[PDB]
Chain A
Amino acid sequence: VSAEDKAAAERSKMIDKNLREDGEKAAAATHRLLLLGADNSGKSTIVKQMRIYHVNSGIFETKFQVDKVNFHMFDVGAQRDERRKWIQCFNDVTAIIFVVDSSDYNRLQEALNDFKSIWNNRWLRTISVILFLNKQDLLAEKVLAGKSKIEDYFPEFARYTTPEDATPEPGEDPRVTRAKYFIRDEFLRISTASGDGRHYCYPHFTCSVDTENARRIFNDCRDIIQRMHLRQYELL
């Protein structure tokens, strides 16, 4: 009623209008992705053409778009080893880009444990995980050399046979196909053991020179959001 009250009310209305405009802008058709991995994993080389380094104080953000849809990918790489607290901030992301160095068997169990912890976490149990088994090229070289046996690091490999649903390249050898699909199945076992049905794992075999990673993330995000909408509409 008073002049000061009216001025405060109009200031609040202008503030709310500006806030709504800023919320509508740059937040429509934009999806956030949390990028995770280890030192050996080529997490920084997943997206080649549109890699964006925006590093100032511990978090560099990578922004890319495939078909008029923008994705913002955040890689937190300046915190300590402990991460059970800072990862609860990333609940909103639509997907988690998990990069694994499948060439190195020694840290493979550590990567599997990290994937297990992320999958079963209370605040990350709704977020789907996009899994990239990088360094497939190296993995093939190691398997073909045969100097290091994956049976030593995983005794279950002896009683494993490649799935019928495998779709290897014509140049791939059966040993290499079996090894890569064994690693993929080792991750998928952890995924489906506690898969709540509201978040899924999408395993992709990637190499460093691979350039379809953005398209794969696009399709995986399409599937994730489509399944979320179907679940919301009682269709799935």
Chain B
Amino acid sequence: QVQLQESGGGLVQPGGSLRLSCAASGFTFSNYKMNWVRQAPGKGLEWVSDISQSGASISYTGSVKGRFTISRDNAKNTLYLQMNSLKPEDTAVYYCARCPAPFTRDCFDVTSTTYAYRGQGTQVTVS
């Protein structure tokens, strides 16, 4: 079965740092791209970052550009998101979501409400 379980999260003061690690099982981690999405209270899912198969191509949302760092560990089948210098505007539930088809440069429905290949979620709160 294909399942994704994130880690990290908790209560952190503004300017703090967190490590969000997502564990992947039941599929080949190298073939698929990986994305991070978050759900602010009362808001829809917002794409945060993205990484390609080799890890060379990385893209970030403008709000989190320059602070968040995304890393992929193919050998350990895990994905990371270093949240450096975060602010209380970042309080949301983070989901690790692979892209549907392997060997593809497109990711259509990663932010969709019922996306099948997302994760359960990690609550990150900032005060």
A117 with B63: CB separation less than 8 A: no
Of B1-9, B17-25, B107-115, the one contacting chain A is B107-115
Is B55 in contact with chain A by the CB < 8 A criterion? Answer: no
Query: Per a CB cutoff under 8 Å, which of B46, B61, B106, B111 touches A120?
Result: B106
Complex interface residues of chain B between 37 and 67 (CB less than 8 A to chain A)? 46-47, 61-63, 65-66
Known contacts A81-B114, A109-B47; decide if A153 and B107 are in contact (CB<8 Å).
Answer: no
Question: Which A residue's beta carbon lies closest to that of B64?
Answer: A155
Is B104 in contact with chain A by the CB < 8 A criterion? Answer: yes
B47 contacts across to A, CB distance below 8 A: 109-110, 113
B107 contacts across to A, CB distance below 8 A: 113, 117
What is the CB-to-nearest-CB distance from A125 to chain B, in angstroms, rounded to a whole number? 9
What is the CB-to-nearest-CB distance from B43 to chain A, in angstroms, rounded to a whole number? 9
How far does the alpha carbon of A109 sit from the alpha carbon of B110 in the complex, in Å?
Answer: 14
Known contacts A109-B47, A110-B47; decide if A83 and B109 are in contact (CB<8 Å).
Answer: yes
A155 with B100: CB separation less than 8 A: no
Query: Per a CB cutoff under 8 Å, which of A82, A118, A122 touches B114?
Result: A82
Known contacts A84-B109, A117-B106, A194-B105; decide if A153 and B115 are in contact (CB<8 Å).
Answer: no
* Chain A interface size range: 20 to 34
How far does the alpha carbon of A155 sit from the alpha carbon of B62 in the complex, in Å?
Answer: 6
Q: Determine the main DSSP class of A at the interface with B.
A: helix
Residue interface mask A99-128, B partner, CB < 8 A = 1 = 000000000011001001111111000000
B62 contacts across to A, CB distance below 8 A: 109, 152-156
Known contacts A109-B47, A121-B106; decide if A84 and B111 are in contact (CB<8 Å).
Answer: no
B106 contacts across to A, CB distance below 8 A: 116-122
How far does the alpha carbon of A1 sit from the alpha carbon of B107 in the complex, in Å?
Answer: 58
How far does the alpha carbon of A118 sit from the alpha carbon of B6 in the complex, in Å?
Answer: 29
Q: Determine the main DSSP class of B at the interface with A.
A: loop
Query: Per a CB cutoff under 8 Å, which of A87, A109, A156, A194 touches B61?
Result: A109
How far does the alpha carbon of A156 sit from the alpha carbon of B113 in the complex, in Å?
Answer: 30
How far does the alpha carbon of A116 sit from the alpha carbon of B99 in the complex, in Å?
Answer: 13
A82 with B112: CB separation less than 8 A: yes
What is the CB-to-nearest-CB distance from B118 to chain A, in angstroms, rounded to a whole number? 12
Question: Which B residue's beta carbon lies closest to that of A151?
Answer: B62
Question: Which B residue's beta carbon lies closest to that of A114?
Answer: B108
A120 with B105: CB separation less than 8 A: yes
A82 with B109: CB separation less than 8 A: yes
How far does the alpha carbon of A82 sit from the alpha carbon of B100 in the complex, in Å?
Answer: 11
B63 with A84: CB separation less than 8 A: no
How far does the alpha carbon of A122 sit from the alpha carbon of B108 in the complex, in Å?
Answer: 12
A87 contacts across to B, CB distance below 8 A: 108
Known contacts A81-B112, A110-B111, A113-B47; decide if A155 and B65 are in contact (CB<8 Å).
Answer: yes
Q: Can you name 14 extra interface pairs (CB under 8 A) apart from A110-B46, A121-B106?
A: A81-B112, A81-B114, A82-B109, A82-B114, A83-B109, A84-B100, A87-B108, A109-B46, A109-B47, A113-B107, A117-B107, A120-B104, A152-B63, A153-B63
The 3 residue pairs across chains A and B that have the minimum distance between CB atoms: A84-B108, A120-B105, A81-B112
A-B contact pairs, 17 of them (CB 8 A): A80-B112, A81-B109, A81-B114, A82-B108, A84-B100, A109-B62, A113-B107, A116-B106, A117-B106, A118-B106, A119-B106, A120-B104, A120-B106, A121-B106, A121-B108, A122-B104, A152-B63
Binding site for A on B (CB under 8 A): 46-47, 61-63, 65-66, 100-101, 104-109, 111-115
